[model samples]
Target chain A: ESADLRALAKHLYDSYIKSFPLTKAKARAILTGKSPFVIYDMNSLMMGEDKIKFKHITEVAIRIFQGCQFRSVEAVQEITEYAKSIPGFVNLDLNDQVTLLKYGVHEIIYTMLASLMNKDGVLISEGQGFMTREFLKSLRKPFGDFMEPKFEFAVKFNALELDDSDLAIFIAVIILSGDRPGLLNVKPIEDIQDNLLQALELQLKLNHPESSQLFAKLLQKMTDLRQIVTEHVQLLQVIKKTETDMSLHPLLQEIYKD
Target chain B: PESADLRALAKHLYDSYIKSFPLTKAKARAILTGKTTDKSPFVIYDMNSLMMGEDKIKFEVAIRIFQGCQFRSVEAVQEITEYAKSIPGFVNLDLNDQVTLLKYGVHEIIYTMLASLMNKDGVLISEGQGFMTREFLKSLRKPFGDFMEPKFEFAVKFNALELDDSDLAIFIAVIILSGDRPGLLNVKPIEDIQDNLLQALELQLKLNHPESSQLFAKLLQKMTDLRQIVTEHVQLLQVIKKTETDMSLHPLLQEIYKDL
Candidate 1:
């Protein structure tokens, strides 16, 4: 049973990691090459000495959101497909699978965000775009604070420098978690989660014999993921209340719908 | 072909868990009653009068809980150190990483096990001492009350899951062998070992909770809750450190909160 489960775990991890080829380090280097999003000198724009137009600020904010939105959707679609391939994952009730994905999408997106981030808190985009912690903070109030906490965790998590294999298991753990509020059969979902967790541990041990602490630190990221998602939900509520001109995707709206 | 070793590893892991947190309810009850035991003396919080005293009394009550809980936490660290050696790959890691995992992972596990000491009424402060009601603990002032009450809340919900020792054994193994800690020399092997433990854990859960898959799911959920509870506890400890300059925390407690 154990050997079979380990083989399954390794296969799942390999497939997921291979599917998402951009690692944090690679993304950081790529984004630095193009240096997207900061098309203008941010310090000069902030100082207002260059007579920066309000329209420019709005354009930057819009572009940032667009970039983030596109990446988020792509990630959800990719991971959802990958999750379906896990043995018995498709066996789950369709509604249960959707519920898990809906609640779980942001966590998965942010897990990738952590992988793509650098210590300077730069989150990359598909087109070699980059969003810095400072630039994001310059956005509208709730929006800025909403993203700051995530950056805080990403900077800390990226410091750990986990490889794709570890990230694959980490994302799987998030996807398979049965903690999402409404579920028809949490047991099987949790059973898969247990197997994933074991697989993640095994991979960590084989990959990093010199450091036992790696396992615990990775687990802590799961906790960090939960905290940031809770904050994200609060930000969603704020958006719902203020009725901003910003339009959320219907899929995102459904995911956040209470 | 490898089933026996895998199964043996699972059994050995479970034994390590039992040895690490050796306290049973009967033994806790015995110690509180001043029975023959090697355990240190611990005070029971008196719920009836907890609110009637000087703020210092509440502080003292908080201290007692801290002392009682800390005693277990300290022993757990040692027991876990012993258990880590039992893990197939743990001792092979750099000594520094071993120290780091023990430093960080022990508190999270300690709070998880604290759930076992709780009942519907409240947590048992000491076996024979008395139950500490959630209402009473919440009623106390700032950092002191802050520390004890939330733990009780988490405890009640966690206890509802009713995880047996076998479930807990696997859960603790998961908590300890994570691969994302900072400063690790390597991580793949750590994750690999965790995969094995998790596989064993699922097998154990299948046999133990055969009636419902929800049990396994619920247990995993509790692990999430456990992490949140510990984060909150550390936040409270941060508060205590800033305001209560005179009151000192034990060195190990202080170390756990470092860089957290």
Candidate 2:
């Protein structure tokens, strides 16, 4: 029984793991092409005492965050395409696929965001950029507020020392999730998710023989992610209501609704 | 072997479907829940692009929405034409044969496609912008409201098969190229086209729905069952056409019903 489960684990490895970009530098450039993103290295910039339009949903903050939203949308669509190749993903109910992708995408996006995160800040576009935590925090209510949870979660998640091969199975676990609401058929999703979980457990045991609690720790990280996403969406709703001047991409708008 | 080509044809059908109807359910459901779209942007007045608040409108606006349903149903025919033309084998057939198939086949196609827009008690219209309830659809005098109950049943069962865009792409093409529709110059060509469509559709079902072994045969049986759905629809509409004088059908839809 577990032999077939291991085959699925191997499939997850080859499909998304081997191919996932290794460096934050190449990670996005491979996923999305062209010009380096604007870097705001708040390491030095945060010390300044300039007037604070950059700190909130100011015109400047709005424009930058708008572009960020677009890039986020572009990345999620790419995630959706990759998800199609997950072993049993395409076989689920059509509506359930929509529900899972709709619900699970933000979790995967934030997890993958681990690639760019440094304790001080995150690197953005090309290998060329860094957006500082101090500078991002200088921004106002929802705009500045959103980054804190992600940064907190990603920093902890990165500490696990899990590689892309591990993240590959991790991605499958969330998307095939029966834990989320509005699923049409729970039994099939649960069965497949269980197999992948078992497979992920075995893979971790071999890879991190010294880190006995690594797999259990990662599952707890999923719980952390749930709270993180809940916070993100709540802040996001405020962005929609109060931040009227800027436009969000339709793809993200759709994702945000449910 | 033709096997490889059939597989390629399956690929093409799904590809064309995604290009033609970009809405693809998830996005559309997003719109129903307040995500907006730019394509075919209709503001959705009940009738004649009529708009109203959700509750307690002038009593008269009820028909306007029904009329809006009529207009959208009419508009779907043209959308069907555009999507069918993109299908691989459709345009090569004789022009009249094309119309005949579309004429009879359009309702079945519409009911099937409505699977995406509806959620049982209500259905979305105007490109997934608003919801009209089963009770609201039932609010009309008699036969007009009664028609949707059967339709709602059909659409729910259809939704259960869990056909995604790719499957629907082929299924929609298969519906349009049906050899059974009357007034065809060449039935044989249409049969051959549907033969390939069913070939690809069955293969897709096997891969996408491995749990349901009876699915392929059930779908074929549903195709004939669809004819009755429309026949019952046509007869009921005829009752309204004769007895209920004030409620009007869009002329294009009327023309389709007149012959049916």
Candidate 3:
């Protein structure tokens, strides 16, 4: 049992878990301008009739959410590179592999994104920079609902307190999901996923036995991420319908349309 | 079994199925040990199922629930055996071969079927009349009460595939006819049977869940996990029985363990 699932876990660690450093959320500050990344908070701004500042902050909040557009593009590249290293990946049906990446990449991003979150906020930049929930909600229109679900998911997922090896196995499991669509062959994909799941079950039993059902919880969490991915796409469509001018990187659009 | 053979077997299996309610092990535990008023999880949708009432089950209730879970395990064995015979080719195996297959494969079948009643947080009992929380499961005594964790882990992922009743019935057939058991008078025939069932499985999934061109692959992966669940369940129970002597062994299970 030990060595059977052993090398699979090793593959995930060698791929991505080893390299992506994690960040933390702060206690937040007295005001938006005072923080490293300013938050345009609805909490303090309230219903106060500083209409000029109100509109000013709303535009800035939109910019804050959109500011990381490049980072979004980069995260996909990171997931791609991360996926390419798992031994079974290159050997899988190529188009099926792409399909898996397309369906599952957002799930991957959000699950790992939890490593950068706390109950109060989520990390945005590469380092200590953080953005609070109120500030995220400060986003206008189709963007308003964009992040609140992610934050809730991120925080609860963080509650699992998974380390690099644990995170690695979970990541590998999602990307290798045999249920992903448009794949002509799932034979090899299923084999690798089975072993990865085997490895994950063993890893959780060993590392987090005290959490009792964390392995089960982790699986349920994946189902939740499926919903998150669906809602995110729905929001993107509404953003398009509203005729809001938001820049989507070419890669995002290419995958999004599919 | 030919053209309509697979479908007939599937419908027969579905109709003849048995539901084991976990007997609300937590309820038995609640009574046996003898039970939180907490804020309910916000249920925007339902007034009834989402009542999310406080479990309020304390230490006394905890022990009784563990006892019920133990009973739940025992209660399902009879039903599990009954369902095995419902499989199309199962009764055709030599009598002893039938016993050997059912003895080993029953746990796998029970767990695969288990997905229907359980979610990650809890399971249903009394045919969905009552429910138990995951907290209740974890709240029970050590490794024995919560072997459920791995089962739950397997079930949640299995449930995600959202297989149909017809789809599930054929998959059970494939599991029972697994080719590689330790003692077999006719291994090739068994392998042939299992292979045929698998073909039906692949065909049915293609029709029902086209969304996943890979759904068949995922179901096979689930088979691997199914084996893991049985192997783990046996070894863990073995240890617990070693220390505690009060537990009675079912005759079928005793014979089941004899070959092992």
Angstrom error at residue B64, model 3: 81
DockQ of each: 0.01, 0.01, 0.01
lDDT of each: 0.65, 0.68, 0.64
Calculate candidate 3's fnat: 0.00
**Model 1 agreement with the true structure over B1-260: per-residue lDDT tens digits:** 66675676667666556544566544554544456756534333454454432232332556655565666565566666555554656644544455566666777777777667666555554333444666666665666777776677787787666577767777788777878776665677778888888777777777777876667667777767677877887887788778877776756556566787
Model 2 lDDT at residue A41: 44
Model 1 chain B: weakest 10-residue lDDT segment is B50-59
Off by over 4 Å in 1: A1-258, B25-61, B64-68, B127-130
Clash pairs, candidate 3, are: B28-B64, B29-B64, B29-B65, B30-B61, B33-B60, B34-B60, B35-B58, B36-B56
TM-scores vs. true structure, each candidate:
0.44, 0.51, 0.43
For residues A223-246, what per-residue lDDT tens digits would candidate 3 score against the true structure? 999999899888877767653545
Q: Of models 1 and 3, which has the larger lDDT?
A: 1
Model 2 chain B weakest 10-residue run by lDDT: B39-48
Candidate 2's C-alpha lDDT? 0.68
